[PDB]
Amino acid sequence: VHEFAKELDATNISIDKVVGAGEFGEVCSGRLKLPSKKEISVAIKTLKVGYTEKQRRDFLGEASIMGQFDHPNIIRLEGVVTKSKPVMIVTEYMENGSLDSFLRKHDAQFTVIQLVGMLRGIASGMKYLSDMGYVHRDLAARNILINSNLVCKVSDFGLSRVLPIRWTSPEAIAYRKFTSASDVWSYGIVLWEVMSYGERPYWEMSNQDVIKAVDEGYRLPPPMDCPAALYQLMLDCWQKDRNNRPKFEQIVSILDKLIRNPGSLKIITPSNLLL
Numbered sequence: 001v002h003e004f005a006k007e008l009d010a011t012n013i014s015i016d017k018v019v020g021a022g023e024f025g026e027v028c029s030g031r032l033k034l035p036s037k038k039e040i041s042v043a044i045k046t047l048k049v050g051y052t053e054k055q056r057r058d059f060l061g062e063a064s065i066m067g068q069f070d071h072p073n074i075i076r077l078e079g080v081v082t083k084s085k086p087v088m089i090v091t092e093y094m095e096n097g098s099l100d101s102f103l104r105k106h107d108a109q110f111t112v113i114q115l116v117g118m119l120r121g122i123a124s125g126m127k128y129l130s131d132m133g134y135v136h137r138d139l140a141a142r143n144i145l146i147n148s149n150l151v152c153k154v155s156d157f158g159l160s161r162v163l164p165i166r167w168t169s170p171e172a173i174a175y176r177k178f179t180s181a182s183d184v185w186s187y188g189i190v191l192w193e194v195m196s197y198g199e200r201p202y203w204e205m206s207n208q209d210v211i212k213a214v215d216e217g218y219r220l221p222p223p224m225d226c227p228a229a230l231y232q233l234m235l236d237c238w239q240k241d242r243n244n245r246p247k248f249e250q251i252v253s254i255l256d257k258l259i260r261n262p263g264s265l266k267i268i269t270p271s272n273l274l275l
């Protein structure tokens with residue numbers, strides 16, 4: 001852990017409030033005083049009292065992964081507290097929380113260009129992640145955090161590995177073939193989530209039907225008022241043949257173009273799912 005994460009002094013951390021319930025203990029918001037004396041807002045994951053040796057390793061395991069990344073679209077690790085209790089992971093604070101819950105509060109309230117900006121940030125973060133040889137395996141709108149300026153950043157490195165059915169590519173579901181191309185599939189689902197303002201992918205379909213339908217060639221339908229360019233990008237991310245999916249670099253380039261001329265987004269697009 002300490003190879004990649006600074007040990008922070010607990011005297012430099014203030015706890016303001018409990019803000020959520022994580023897998024391993026509550027999440028708080030607070031402040032961190034840096035060595036330069038600058039004070040920043042932080043999010044603080046705590047490890048529950050009475051944790052096992054195993055829970056502690058898996059908890060801190062995420063920090064070991066997060067700490068290897070330094071990118072504007074990947075949640076920044078400020079450090080860990082292990083020498084006192086509770087054990088903590090301290091990250092940059094993201095005022096607007098998880099992207100799916102944020103978008104659900106604002107159905108149809110953002111411009112296409114604003115949504116594209118969010119999507120471009122996520123793609124850029126994933127381009128960096130894939131460049132470092134990590135497959136996220138849990139790329140979903142609920143695992144993207146969004147700040148006060150609407151910048152989106154990849155979070156939740158709990159399932160991440162060095163090289164969730166609704167978000168997983170067919171081949172990864174079929175035989176655990178996880179590659180950066182399976183993350184690209186997940187990115188296509190996130191793209192659908194964003195353009196749908198946080199609608200649940202495949203709604204409440206039974207998992208075996210999600211698995212069978214996607215395998216048969218069915219895809220999520222275009223969200224209401226979705227630009228053709230963005231729906232096509234979803235379909236490209238969802239190619240059955242993983243070698244035909246775009247790379248994250250190409251996705252970033254595609255979105256950089258749509259951001260560049262919103263007069264591209266003017267063309268708008270028997271079963272729920274489409275064949």
Ligand SMILES: Cc1ccc(O)cc1-n1c(=O)c2c(c3c(N)ncnc31)CCCC2
Binds near residue numbers: 020091097098145
């Ligand atoms: C604190 C934290 C550490 C690691 C990680 O993967 C995610 C988080 N984290 C979080 O787990 C959460 C939030 C959050 C936030 N608002 N800002 C920064 N990190 C955060 C707010 C929503 C509730 C969960």
